[PDB]
Amino acid sequence: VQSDTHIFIIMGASGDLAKKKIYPTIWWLFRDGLLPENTFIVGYARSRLTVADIRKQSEPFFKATPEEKLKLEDFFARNSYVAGQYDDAASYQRLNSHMNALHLGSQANRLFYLALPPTVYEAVTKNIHESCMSQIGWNRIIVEKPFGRDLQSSDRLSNHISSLFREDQIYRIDHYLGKEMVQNLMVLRFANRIFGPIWNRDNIACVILTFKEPFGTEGRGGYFDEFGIIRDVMQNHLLQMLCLVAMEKPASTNSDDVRDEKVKVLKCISEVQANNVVLGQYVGNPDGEGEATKGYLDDPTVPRGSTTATFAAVVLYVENERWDGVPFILRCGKALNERKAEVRLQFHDVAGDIFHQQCKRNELVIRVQPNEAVYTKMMTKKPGMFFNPEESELDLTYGNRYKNVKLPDAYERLILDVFCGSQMHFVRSDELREAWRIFTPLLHQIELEKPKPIPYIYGSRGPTEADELMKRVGFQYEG
Amino acid sequence: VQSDTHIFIIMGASGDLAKKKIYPTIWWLFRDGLLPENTFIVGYARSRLTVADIRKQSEPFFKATPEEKLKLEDFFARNSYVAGQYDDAASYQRLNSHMNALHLGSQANRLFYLALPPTVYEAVTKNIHESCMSQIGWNRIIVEKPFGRDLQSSDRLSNHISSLFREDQIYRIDHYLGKEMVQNLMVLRFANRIFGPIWNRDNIACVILTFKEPFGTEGRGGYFDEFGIIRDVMQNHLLQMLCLVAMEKPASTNSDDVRDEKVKVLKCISEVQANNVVLGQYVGNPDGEGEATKGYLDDPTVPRGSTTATFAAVVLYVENERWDGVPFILRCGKALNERKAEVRLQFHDVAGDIFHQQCKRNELVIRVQPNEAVYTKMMTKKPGMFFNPEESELDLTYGNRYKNVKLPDAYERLILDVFCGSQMHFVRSDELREAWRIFTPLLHQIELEKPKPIPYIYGSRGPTEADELMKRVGFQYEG
Amino acid sequence: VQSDTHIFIIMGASGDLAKKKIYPTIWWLFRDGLLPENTFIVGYARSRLTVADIRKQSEPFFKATPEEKLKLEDFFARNSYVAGQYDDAASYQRLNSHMNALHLGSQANRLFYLALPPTVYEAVTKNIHESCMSQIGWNRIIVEKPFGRDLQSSDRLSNHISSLFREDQIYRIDHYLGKEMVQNLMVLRFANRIFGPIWNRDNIACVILTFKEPFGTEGRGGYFDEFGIIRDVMQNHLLQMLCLVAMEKPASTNSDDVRDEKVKVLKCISEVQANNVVLGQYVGNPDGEGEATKGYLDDPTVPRGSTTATFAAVVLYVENERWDGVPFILRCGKALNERKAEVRLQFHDVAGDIFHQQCKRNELVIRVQPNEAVYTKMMTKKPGMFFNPEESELDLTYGNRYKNVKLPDAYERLILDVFCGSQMHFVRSDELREAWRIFTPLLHQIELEKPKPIPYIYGSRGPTEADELMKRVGFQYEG
Amino acid sequence: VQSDTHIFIIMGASGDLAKKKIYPTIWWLFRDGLLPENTFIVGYARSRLTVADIRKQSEPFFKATPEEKLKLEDFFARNSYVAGQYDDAASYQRLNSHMNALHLGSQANRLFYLALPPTVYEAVTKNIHESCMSQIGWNRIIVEKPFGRDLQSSDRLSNHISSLFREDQIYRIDHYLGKEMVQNLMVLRFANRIFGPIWNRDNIACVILTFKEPFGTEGRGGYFDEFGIIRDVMQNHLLQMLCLVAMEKPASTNSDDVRDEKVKVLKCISEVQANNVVLGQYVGNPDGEGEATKGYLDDPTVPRGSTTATFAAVVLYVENERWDGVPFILRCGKALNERKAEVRLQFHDVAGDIFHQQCKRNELVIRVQPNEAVYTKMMTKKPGMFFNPEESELDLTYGNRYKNVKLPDAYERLILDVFCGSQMHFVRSDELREAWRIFTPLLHQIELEKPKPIPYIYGSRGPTEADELMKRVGFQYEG
């Protein structure tokens, strides 16, 4: 419900991230009438392009119906492109002049989407700060990963940026925080009683945060290798999920009241020991099809003799009254058997058994994807003419209960949040700090010693050794 | 055993319950092959008849298909009759010899199902103990309601019967104890941790035990006018469900280990008080359907100026560490807006609301019928581009999950139990005693003071004063 | 406050238990005006004595002040002695005639104190039942240990007695149940909130029931040897304490409502494994004085080459929701360093430590004796100009708070209880059963294998090995 | 450090607080050898004086003994004076050079203790920042109350001061935070398990924070008439204790980790409401003692028709998971029946009473003064031959347990802290802000509406309406 004019600046428009995620995503929001009326889109890159060009290369990506022709015409009518250089100050001054010329560009709120490489980040933020900033309206910078590789590399940038911009201006992206069920963890936990008395070490045996992809690095091992999986999905995604699951109740649903509690949790976490860790690497599958018979080292982009993991099983620990002793198992990997992002709370066994070991540990499962759902695995009396216990479940499936309700992409809701000034779902400075504090030591070690990752066949569940790190830590599987 | 010869004596075989429930039930158990091979069905009554007549008057209750014309012959081929009076030892010595004439009759196991009026209960048990008893096998007597009009009344009956038979011989019936969801209560709470720590005064705001029928006294309100709704459905059915919901975890799934926990709960339920009771008597709905246009008094089988309650709402309190203070609402009525039998726990509101009053109390619901299911009404984030909390639920509906499966009749399963020697789901002497100690003082006040029940329209929900009573004690209703 | 005439029959009056415990104890109650007015005392034994004789040998034991001369004269005026035989029926008939002659002896309530050997028990109960029983007043039998040695030996007597007498007539003695603080466990636990939320496996690390005597078998090893310490103090005393500490809350403080819960607890206890057990035997102390330099085998009454324990450390386990997993450590012994009977609850460590391991496990201590007290060991800020934590305590000492209040001997209150018809502090049949069920297997084993008990110097704390059975089981000592 | 040179500048040295509290305090710290070796005491004021005068007017407050006539010389040998005005930069440039003349003055650590009126607070901080500041060592400013009359008033002061100094430089004082038992709160709850799980809404019925003085406005009610009881003792003292009792367990015993938890609790305390407040103003007791015969208005220093409250009772609510619903009673008054400062938690009644209403609510009491102690009022079995429950208590009285030990003054310890650099026990900006946000709305209503305080006799307990208010909210009182 805004009247303020808006400028959405996509830095690196000729890019692939902007051309296939950012542009299309902002189209979806323009179409669905989710953006303020007076909103302009400006793309900025070296390549000397026209709005005819940006459209030609992006439209194949808008998933547009011929009934939207008019809305498309209207969207691009509000689009412009400014060719400029990334480390040049005059190019940036032009960008600014262009914006001021836009209708009310002077008082408009500027939203800068950094769709560039991190190698560029500093130059761009330093340059935007000087030239490209509004003085009447607010200015906000949308950032993304990676936010460094080391704790030193990140604090290096965190501080550079933190010196020109405030935190109420920085919006760092962890798209998982834009995911429906991930976002649901808060209401589920804090709006429900049935899930309160049980949310502790007293009742929970262990917690599992799972990341699974059926495919692996796809002829793109080059970029990956310098990254590993931990730095790729663990330090960010998996960890964020953990927070929302372990954090205490905030004073409010307020942006920075919530974030404090997330940091509070990361601070109760001691460092990952290389004894509770289990790395793996994907070798090919001789009995498969296509890319499936190709290992990771079977990639030319892939350095010759890599100790880089494409699978990691890790046990973290939240040292406080609520979780003191409860193992948090973060199991992430590519080249696995399926696509799954989920949170799982395996509850302890019941005291005093009158059912003769017939019962199986209860479980709360939040399936981020696919098939959005929150279900409770428990025991029921075997239906019919039987008296024994049986494993059953109470479910909430978005597919049946909420058949005809579209769940938005993380970007749509996350971009929309930057338009609203809602940082609650964006990573905060101190958060990154703590995330690096935990993994940095381990990630370093993996570099000095360069351990040999356990191999696993493409389409497998990963290295068996991880499963044992699980049972050893307190996980029971039968069911 | 499952090789042993059994005789199933149906006393009052010409009756309507015999010919409409017992006979048709015993045959299904037969057809579905649940009864033991060597079982014989002997009917005993006055009306001198032939197994041929019996077939004709009960056969339109068999729910049988043409495909099973022979099994019925197989069935009726194990049937017999023995005409006699209920207090003539000549007739009984006849019933005996008859069974003694059956193959291994003298060595068999005997099941006396009593399908007679409670006036004959006295005489029959005697003569059964006097003549028709086994010396080689077991003897069990199935007694059905009603078990007396008052604590003193029931004491008379119970004492007589127990003067002749032991408790492992007495099978008191309450079919609700043979209903699927009702039996599932035990396993639901004691087999799961997810439901353990919320099951107490600290988390539960109140418990509501509901019983409703869309119909009324179908042309026969002269029988009921003697008993009333409380005696009819509350003292027995509703009270049993409260026992299962309220009881402590037993030492084992054993009969008198479970039945002990049941009686123990009743023992700490103080007597009901009229200032915690709402009585209703239905009237007709002129803008009505058919049978609805007629209320209780619009039946001549029903005496004049009757003040008999066709609806009751009673608040009970279980005084103990677990339930001290939690109200147990017992709402039972006839001629309402629906046919439902369910257990429902309304939990307290979460402490420290961060969601601005938008939050509704959680609820565990166990619908005994219809559509057998157990679900938890909870709060989830409004799905889509919304952050506010919305009411949803996690369900375990049997119709979907267990489409295939066949949920048996309460009598099919209950009767089958008398065969295995399971008293779990049969009312004990003490239990029955405790249940009368609770309701008598009030039942008496109603016969003495003779208050005028609040009228309520046929199809309605009953007197609003019932809803008011619910509020006053803690019940929080949506709207 | 009774008018009923009373007869207190001391069977085995010339005995030492009657002459030094029973007689004097009943004198204390007569004096303090605790007995009914019309109360007669009859002593029964083979020895042909007069009330002049019984007095001469007992008075040295009454701890009487010359100001009680008159009360003494009055006490013995109400005393009589009947010489008779233990297995003769005429001797018993005389006893009866004597009682009927006492003023209103016919309608008087008879209380039979079995101050005899167990070798006699049966003969006496069988004989009393026939002759010596009132028909107008109640009759009660006061029994004592041992109640058998095996579960079979006890069930043997339990049943003999149980066949002539009801349980509401049997009063079995465990003098520890007559001890102030032991009796206090109920109020402490069930009348206080501060001791509720903490009384569970969630908070309690372990429980310790301690029995200690500074002296050992005193030239009386003969009687002891056939007994051991387990059968002597563990199966009874220590176990009873455990019950009162582990039992759930009863429906009332009622005699048999309380006892049910005690049995309930013993039934959740699985058998003592010889792996969690630690026996010991006391060798002498070459650097001591008097009996202190004498071992146990240094007793001639002591069989030549004994494997009999005078010290036992045992870990029991209550398998239920409250104590599931919490080790119950029963540590009993003679020839130890001190006299102590106490209950101790060591609580778990606090989660999330901001004090740097400066804190010591909390502890609830109930000291049965000496120095009656219930105190709470916890942490305080070091008093004065310090900020660190320090171990301190909150105490309730009967010596200061209740300076001038006499705490009675177990016998006075326990005997008085038999006069009131209060069985709550007397062992019940089913209880003995369960106690034997646990230890019988272990006690047997110790007989077949005849293991060599670890030796320990008179005045020691016992075998070090027990201390480790402690830490291993979860006990921390520093403080 | 403990080798570093320090200067202790006492601004307003001729004042009564200086000469009566600060000087005598600083010397004890000196004599007891707590101050660092190289410490200098520089007095600054108007009245042109000599260290000689200062000695004579403060020396009768030294609590000194003849045995220490020399230490005082050692003390006064480190004393200096600097006459000047409070808003003349000439006088200040004098104060400086003076310290610069002291040994290592230019390199020293500086402590500006402000013993002046709040009118001068503004000017002084300025000039201290303008001239009298160090460049080599640390500068800390000790500000005492009052910190403004309203939220707006305090915002003015806080903002000025913070415009010059940082928070690690500002030391706001509340001596109650330097009292033994008050400081022990932290360790009492967070260092023990015995007090952890009962510390919540589930177990606590209510919290009562008490402050009383047996005396009144001793001849000086013109100063107080401007402020009132709430501003005087509740907003500060009482509120701080509630913070410590109510706060969540901090991440560490660190200043702004603890101070964070304090502010967090205040942040969820809604503003007070008049319908939850009782105001009293004392009158004289004719059957009186001496000074008692005179009430507030019977003093001419006190304006006429004054409606200033000399007693207040306020109910607050901390809206959160832990305390939601629990009432925090703030009872503070002058001219009562005693001098007491204590924290008290009244627990709920146990569920399922098996002791027949004889049971009283348990209570954890922490008496700050007098007779520093912490005890728990509980129920124990009436000692002796009784079975009924009686009220007793487990105590930790410092007078007995720590006879020997010396509990220091709040200022002795507090001041010593400014020396170590500990702000734990010093009020932060936000805290102070939150504390005014809570009481302002009401303070204003009192100045606007000007209600007439309920009179109460000198020596009494205050208005009964206060006791009534306590009841209504849950307070259960014996009798």
Ligand SMILES: O=P(O)(O)OC[C@H]1O[C@@H](O)[C@H](O)[C@@H](O)[C@@H]1O
């Ligand atoms: O889970 P989603 O939304 O498919 O996204 C997963 C991707 O998230 C990215 O952040 C990771 O870098 C990818 O390696 C990963 O595959």
Ligand SMILES: O=P(O)(O)OC[C@H]1O[C@@H](O)[C@H](O)[C@@H](O)[C@@H]1O
């Ligand atoms: O729920 P069900 O099995 O139909 O049972 C309902 C009937 O149960 C009987 O016990 C009552 O006496 C009837 O009045 C009632 O209608």
Ligand SMILES: O=P(O)(O)OC[C@H]1O[C@@H](O)[C@H](O)[C@@H](O)[C@@H]1O
């Ligand atoms: O603990 P108390 O009252 O001294 O009694 C302890 C005695 O109790 C007896 O039951 C035991 O048989 C003795 O061996 C033991 O010493």
Ligand SMILES: O=P(O)(O)OC[C@H]1O[C@@H](O)[C@H](O)[C@@H](O)[C@@H]1O
């Ligand atoms: O409890 P203490 O240390 O004596 O403090 C009491 C005094 O504290 C002061 O803060 C109040 O302004 C005085 O009015 C009060 O008398």
